[PDB]
Amino acid sequence: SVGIVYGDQYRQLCCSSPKFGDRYALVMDLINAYKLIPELSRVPPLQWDSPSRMYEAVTAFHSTEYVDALKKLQMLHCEEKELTADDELLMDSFSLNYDCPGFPSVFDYSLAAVQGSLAAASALICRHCEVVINWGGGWHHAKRSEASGFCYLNDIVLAIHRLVSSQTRVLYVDLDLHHGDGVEEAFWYSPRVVTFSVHHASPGFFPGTGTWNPIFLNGAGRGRFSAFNLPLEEGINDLDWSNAIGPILDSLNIVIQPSYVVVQCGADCLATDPHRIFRLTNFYPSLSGYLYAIKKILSWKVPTLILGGGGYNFPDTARLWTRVTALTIEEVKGKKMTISPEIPEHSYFSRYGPDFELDIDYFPDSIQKHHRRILEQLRNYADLNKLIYDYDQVYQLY
Numbered sequence: 001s002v003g004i005v006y007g008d009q010y011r012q013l014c015c016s017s018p019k020f021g022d023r024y025a026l027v028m029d030l031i032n033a034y035k036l037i038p039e040l041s042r043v044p045p046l047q048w049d050s051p052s053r054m055y056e057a058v059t060a061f062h063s064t065e066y067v068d069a070l071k072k073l074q075m076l077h078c079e080e081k082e083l084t085a086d087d088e089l090l091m092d093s094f095s096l097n098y099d100c101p102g103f104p105s106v107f108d109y110s111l112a113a114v115q116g117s118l119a120a121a122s123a124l125i126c127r128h129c130e131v132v133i134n135w136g137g138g139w140h141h142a143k144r145s146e147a148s149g150f151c152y153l154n155d156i157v158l159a160i161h162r163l164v165s166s167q168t169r170v171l172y173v174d175l176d177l178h179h180g181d182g183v184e185e186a187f188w189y190s191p192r193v194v195t196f197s198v199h200h201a202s203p204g205f206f207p208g209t210g211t212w213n214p215i216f217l218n219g220a221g222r223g224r225f226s227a228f229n230l231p232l233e234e235g236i237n238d239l240d241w242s243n244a245i246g247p248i249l250d251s252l253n254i255v256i257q258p259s260y261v262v263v264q265c266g267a268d269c270l271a272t273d274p275h276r277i278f279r280l281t282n283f284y285p286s287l288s289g290y291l292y293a294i295k296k297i298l299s300w301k302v303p304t305l306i307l308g309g310g311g312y313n314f315p316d317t318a319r320l321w322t323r324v325t326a327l328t329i330e331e332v333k334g335k336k337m338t339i340s341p342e343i344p345e346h347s348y349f350s351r352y353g354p355d356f357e358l359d360i361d362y363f364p365d366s367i368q369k370h371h372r373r374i375l376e377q378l379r380n381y382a383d384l385n386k387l388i389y390d391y392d393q394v395y396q397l398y
């Protein structure tokens with residue numbers, strides 16, 4: 001079956017941040033308005049038997065002092081008076097500031113995404129679901145002891161950690177506009193989690209990594225060659241983006257043969273995202289790069305975790321993720337999902353004005369070098385990890 005993470009409290013928590021507002025509610029209500037929920041198995045967010053069990057789950061990746069600091073930040077923001085200078089300095093030392101501010105629910109909000117993605121991972125492990133979707137998750141920037149890019153807790157690293165420790169290999173695929181640095185870094189020394197991020201990179205653009213460093217770094221120790229990156233120039237469309245990553249996806253699957261796939265599907269590559277950097281769509285006839293990638297990944301028939309991420313045009317993120325959700329049901333259950341080109345009436349209908357259609361409102365050799373580089377890296381990866389692959393069969397894809 002296809003699972004999806006939601007619950008009433010979950011919804012409230014995912015909608016309590018100053019940066020992403022009610023986006024999750026738009027997403028889940030658009031999915032509901034298109035009658036997709038009856039097709040889906042609800043996956044309840046994980047809860048724990050005690051504070052100690054919660055901490056040992058979260059400190060599987062994050063340091064105890066960082067988790068303490070985040071929890072204290074929440075408490076401090078549930079009080080009237082300003083932070084002391086000592087508290088400011090403490091928060092600064094974990095980058096809990098600037099673009100990662102405190103707010104009254106910052107800990108519960110962050111933890112919620114972890115609860116969802118851990119429950120999603122468990123539903124895959126026990127084989128209750130073939131695919132699980134968590135649109136409240138996908139926070140790929142958070143580090144062991146540092147908030148970054150409005151990511152406070154890295155639900156992806158924790159979910160992946162549960163998957164590998166269940167021999168097991170995980171392929172992580174990061175489609176967000178931004179480099180998934182936090183996930184990449186977490187598994188930098190681990191060959192069993194192969195990470196692949198496609199993203200914009202350019203001087204001064206956040207977070208700075210996932211590109212020429214001059215050479216391409218790609219893992220260390222036994223994890224050498226296990227971190228893959230494809231940095232792309234601004235302005236790329238659905239077709240060029242698809243052609244850029246399609247051969248890479250297929251070759252990674254063939255060579256790695258992952259036991260699980262985890263996909264971060266941040267929607268900030270949409271042409272209508274305020275970043276205005278890539279020109280991807282949610283079109284399903286030209287064809288959305290997102291839907292192309294997901295369809296390709298689901299065709300592998302590997303247990304899969306699909307996560308959200310970036311996406312700052314909320315109704316258009318809803319439009320895309322509603323389509324990813326329908327496509328997942330169709331590919332997994334083999335049952336056609338017809339989605340009306342018009343937005344159905346529902347609680348958030350007015351947010352989709354003024355045209356109220358499902359399509360986003362938009363009218364549409366460097367890469368060849370990157371493919372050779374990535375092919376060579378995949379070869380070094382296989383060599384280092386003694387994996388058997390048809391070098392030709394892989395080379396033909398490109």
Ligand SMILES: O=NC(=O)c1cccc(NC(=O)c2ccccc2)c1
Pocket residue numbers: 141149150176178206266268274275309310311312
């Ligand atoms: O995956 N990471 C992100 O999505 C991310 C991280 C940092 C900054 C930003 N940028 C913004 O928050 C933003 C919001 C509105 C308009 C322009 C940029 C995005």
Ligand SMILES: [K+]
Pocket residue numbers: 174175176177178179180197198199
């Ligand atoms: K990415």
Ligand SMILES: [K+]
Pocket residue numbers: 187188189190191192193194195219223226227
């Ligand atoms: K790795």
Ligand SMILES: [Zn+2]
Pocket residue numbers: 176177178266268309310311
């Ligand atoms: Zn992003």
